[PDB]
Structures are given as structure tokens and as C-alpha cells.
């Protein structure tokens, strides 16, 4: 006669935290590559000038 309390609260919270961390890591990688793109654009602009 299973009740209504959540079965594995710690496991569920771990899954949620893992999802948040994964998405933050993806954003960080995107930002790093975007900064690299900015630097390359500045160098190319200088050389074209």
C-alpha cells in the first residue's frame, strides 16, 4: 500500500543538480569559444586594415 511521500528525494535532487551543472558547463564552453571568435575577428580586422 505505497503512500504519497517521494521515494528517493536525494536521487531526484542529484539528478536536478546534475542537469543544472551540465547546462552551465555548456554555456561556459559557448562563452569561451565566443571570446576566441572575438579575438580572431579583431586580429583579422587589423590585418585587413
Amino acid at each position: 500500500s505505497a503512500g504519497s511521500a517521494t521515494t528517493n528525494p536525494l536521487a531526484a535532487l542529484d539528478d536536478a543538480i546534475s542537469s543544472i551543472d551540465k547546462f552551465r558547463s555548456s554555456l561556459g564552453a559557448i562563452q569561451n569559444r565566443l571570446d576566441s571568435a572575438v579575438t580572431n575577428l579583431n586580429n583579422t580586422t587589423t590585418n585587413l586594415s
Binding site: 551543472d21 551540465k22 555548456s26 564552453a29 569561451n32 569559444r33 571568435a37 580572431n40 583579422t44
Partner: protein
Amino acid sequence: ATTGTNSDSDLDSIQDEIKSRLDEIDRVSGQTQFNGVNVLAKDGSMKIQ
């Protein structure tokens, strides 16, 4: 990444970053252009008078 302390999620995040930077290398190589010529996309040579 090669350290044995890192767990599966850590390796996944590191590989995500590595894939992002490899994509950046490919993007820069493909899109670098001078006077309508992709210098880094061909294996030819240019003759200067």
C-alpha cells in the same frame, strides 16, 4: 581529463568543451578569407609577380 579521479560526468563535460574548441578550429579554418580566397581551405599556391 586523463586523470582517473574524474568521474563520468566530469569526462562528459570536458569532452563537451573539447568538441566546442574543435568546432571553433574548423570554423576559423573554413571561414578565414582574404580577397574572396579561402587561404586555409585549399592546398594550392599563389604566385606573386
